[PDB]
Design a protein around this ligand. Structure first.
Ligand SMILES: OC[C@H]1O[C@@H](O[C@H]2[C@H](O)[C@@H](O)[C@H](O)O[C@@H]2CO)[C@H](O)[C@@H](O)[C@H]1O
Ligand SMILES: OC[C@H]1O[C@@H](O[C@H]2[C@H](O)[C@@H](O)[C@H](O)O[C@@H]2CO)[C@H](O)[C@@H](O)[C@H]1O
Ligand SMILES: CC(=O)N[C@@H]1[C@@H](O)[C@H](O)[C@@H](CO)O[C@H]1O
Lengths: 264, 206, 41
C-alpha cells in the first residue's frame, strides 16, 4: 500500500524466451549484452530506478555509437554522460532510450549468446521484450467471437476459430516474451500476418518463426489482439463469420469480432 | 449519486434490484420487486441506508459483504460453491424470497457471477461458458486468486506508473491447471487483458 | 441494467457485463487503457 516504487529488481526476457544477460558476468565498464537462457544469476538480474536507469552489477545499461559502436553494454553511471543510460519500457514490449528517438533494443538472431543491439524501430518480434521475473511463455487458449477458440489447423498451416474442446492440443497457444503466439505442440511454428489478403487487409496465419514485424502481437486493455506502435491494427474474424474461417488484421473499430480473451 | 442499481430477474419472472457501491465495487443492499422489505449488509455504508430503498423497511443482515463473512455465514468456501445459469436462477429466487438459511450462499453466486465477472474477463468467460455449454463450474485457485487479489492488483497497476510498469510487490496468481504465476509487472496478459475495471487507490497518470 | 435469465445466453450475458463495465468504468481516467471506477454517477 504505497504508490511510489523507488527501486526494483526483475529480469528481462525476449525472443524465443531468452534472457537479457551481461556477457560472462564480466563487470568492467564496457562489458557486452547477450541473450542467454534464463537463470538465477546476478548478471541476468536487472534493477530499475526512479531516475530512469536500469542496472546490473552496480552499473547501468548503456548505448552509444561514439564509445561502444552499435552494441549495448553496462557501464559505470558516475563516469559516463547522462543521456546514454536513460531507458523507457512501453506497453507493447518496446525497450528504448528516449534520447535516441528512432531506435529500439534488438536481438538480431534468436540463438544463445547473440550480442544485443540498438536498431531502428520497426516494431519487430525481435525488438519486443517482456519485463518481469516470470520468463516462461504464458500457455492457454485464445477465445474470440461467440466463445470459439482459435485453432491451429490444416497440419498447422492455417488458423481459424473453432468450437471449444477441453485440452485440444492445437487449440492451446503459448504467448512468448517476444510478442509471438506460438503453437503449444510445436514452438518453431508461430502466428503471423501473411502477405495474402482479403478485402484489402492482411490474412493472419501460421508460419515458421523468423522474428519479423508480421509476428509481434500485444494483448491490449480493450481486449484486442493488436500490433504494437502508434499506428495500430488488430486481429479480426472477417465479418464475424466463422464459416469463412479467416482472421484479417484490420483498422481497430473495436467491435465483438475484434474482442478476444486469453483463457489460461 | 454514489450507488448503482441493476436488476436480476428469474425463470419465474421474479425480479430483485441489487445496489452496488461504485466506490468499492461491492453489493450493499437489495430489494425484491413489489416488496416493502429491503435488505442491507451489516457493513453497508451509512449513505446507502440514507439514500437507497427509502420507501421500505430496511433490514440489517447478519453478515458483511466481505468474502470471509459470506463464507463463514454460508458454511462453505467459494472453492465449493458451483456457479452457472441454474445456480444463479436459484440464487435470485432465494434473494426474492428472503430465505435466511440460503442468503450468504445466494450472494456468493450473485457476486461472483456479476461483480467478479465485471472485474476480470477470465471470470466473465468462465461464466459465459456455463451459459454456452449448459453446464456449471465451481471455481479453482485461478478465479479465487483473482477475486482475492483485485484490490492489490489495482494498487500495483497504479503504483507501477512510478517505475516503468513494475509492481511494488509480487502478486501471486494461478492458472487453470493450478500452477503458480508470480506476477510482478504490468507486462503480462494475465493482468492487462484480464482486468476490466480497477479499484482507485492513488491519483496517478499513465 | 436488467439481466433476465428466462431468455439469456452468452450473448446477452456478455452485453450485460458490458453495460455494468460501461456505467461503472471511467471514460476519462484509465491507466494502460484499464479504466478506474467512476468517482460519481
Ligand atoms: O559468456 C556468456 C555467459 O557466461 C556464463 O557464465 C560463464 C562465465 O562467463 C565463464 O567465465 C565461466 O567459465 O563459465 C560460466 C558458465 O558456467 C553465464 O552463466 C551466462 O548467463 C552468459 O552470461
Ligand atoms: O467481413 C470483414 C469485415 O466486416 C466489416 O463489417 C461489415 C459486416 O461484416 C457486413 O455484414 C456489412 O454488410 O458490412 C460491414 C462493413 O460496412 C468490418 O467493418 C471490418 O472490420 C471487417 O471485420
Ligand atoms: C562471429 C563473431 O565474430 N562473433 C562475435 C565475436 O567475434 C565477438 O568477440 C563478440 C563480441 O564483440 O561478438 C560475437
Amino acid at each position: 500500500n504505497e504508490c511510489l516504487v523507488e527501486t526494483r529488481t526483475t529480469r528481462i526476457s525476449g525472443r524465443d524466451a531468452l534472457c537479457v544477460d551481461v556477457a560472462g558476468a564480466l563487470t568492467s565498464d564496457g562489458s557486452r549484452l547477450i541473450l542467454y537462457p534464463c537463470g538465477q544469476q546476478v548478471n541476468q538480474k536487472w534493477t530499475f530506478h526512479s531516475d530512469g536507469t536500469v542496472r546490473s552489477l552496480g552499473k547501468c545499461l548503456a548505448t552509444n555509437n561514439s564509445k561502444f559502436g552499435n552494441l549495448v553494454v553496462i557501464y559505470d553511471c558516475s563516469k559516463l554522460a547522462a543521456e546514454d543510460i536513460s531507458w523507457d519500457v512501453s506497453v507493447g514490449g518496446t525497450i528504448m532510450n528516449p534520447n535516441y528517438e528512432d531506435l529500439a533494443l534488438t536481438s538480431n538472431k534468436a540463438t544463445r549468446s547473440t550480442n544485443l543491439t540498438m536498431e531502428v524501430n520497426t516494431y519487430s518480434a525481435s525488438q519486443g521484450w517482456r519485463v518481469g521475473n516470470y520468463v516462461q511463455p504464458i500457455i492457454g487458449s485464445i477465445v474470440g467471437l461467440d466463445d470459439m477458440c482459435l485453432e491451429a489447423t490444416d497440419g498447422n498451416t492455417n488458423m481459424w476459430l473453432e468450437e471449444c474442446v477441453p485440452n485440444q492440443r492445437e487449440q492451446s497457444w503459448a504467448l512468448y516474451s517476444d510478442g509471438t503466439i506460438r503453437v503449444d505442440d510445436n514452438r518453431e511454428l508461430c502466428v503471423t500476418a501473411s502477405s495474402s489478403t482479403y478485402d484489402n487487409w492482411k490474412v493472419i496465419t501460421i508460419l515458421n518463426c523468423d522474428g519479423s514485424n508480421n509476428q509481434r502481437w500485444v494483448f491490449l486493455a480493450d481486449g484486442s489482439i493488436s500490433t504494437p506502435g502508434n499506428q495500430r491494427l488488430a486481429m479480426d474474424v472477417a465479418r464475424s463469420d466463422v464459416d469463412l474461417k479467416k482472421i484479417i488484421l484490420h483498422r481497430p473499430h473495436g467491435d465483438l469480432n475484434q474482442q478476444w480473451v486469453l483463457f489460461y | 449519486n454514489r450507488f448503482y442499481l441493476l436488476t436480476l430477474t428469474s425463470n419465474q419472472d421474479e425480479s430483485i434490484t441489487l445496489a452496488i457501491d461504485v466506490e468499492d465495487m461491492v453489493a450493499v443492499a437489495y430489494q425484491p420487486a413489489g416488496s416493502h422489505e429491503s435488505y442491507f449488509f451489516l457493513n453497508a455504508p451509512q449513505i446507502a441506508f440514507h439514500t437507497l430503498f427509502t420507501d421500505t423497511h430496511q433490514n440489517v443482515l447478519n453478515f458483511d459483504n466481505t468474502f470471509k463473512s459470506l463464507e463463514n455465514a454460508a458454511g462453505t468456501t467459494r472453492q465449493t460453491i458451483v456457479l452457472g445459469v441454474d445456480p444463479l436462477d436459484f440464487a435470485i429466487s432465494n434473494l426474492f424470497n428472503a430465505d435466511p438459511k440460503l442468503l450468504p450462499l445466494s450472494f456468493l453466486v450473485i457476486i461472483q457471477m456479476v461483480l467478479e465477472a465485471s472485474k476480470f474477463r477470465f471470470i466473465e468467460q468462465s461464466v459465459a461458458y456455463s451459459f454456452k455449454n449448459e453446464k456449471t463450474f465451481l471455481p479453482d485457485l485461478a478465479i479465487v486468486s483473482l477475486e482475492d487479489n483485485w484490490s492489490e492488483i489495482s494498487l500495483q497497476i497504479q503504483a507501477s506508473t512510478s517505475l516503468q510498469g513494475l509492481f511494488g510487490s509480487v502478486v501471486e496468481l494461478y492458472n487453470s491447471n493450478n500452477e503458480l504465476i508470480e506476477v510482478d509487472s504490468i507486462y503480462y496478459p494475465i493482468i492487462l487483458a484480464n482486468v476490466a475495471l480497477q479499484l482507485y487507490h492513488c491519483q496517478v497518470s499513465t | 441494467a436488467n439481466l433476465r435469465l428466462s431468455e439469456a445466453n452468452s450473448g446477452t450475458y456478455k452485453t450485460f457485463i458490458g453495460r455494468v463495465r460501461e456505467e461503472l468504468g471511467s471514460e476519462t481516467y484509465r491507466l494502460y487503457g484499464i479504466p478506474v471506477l467512476k468517482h460519481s454517477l
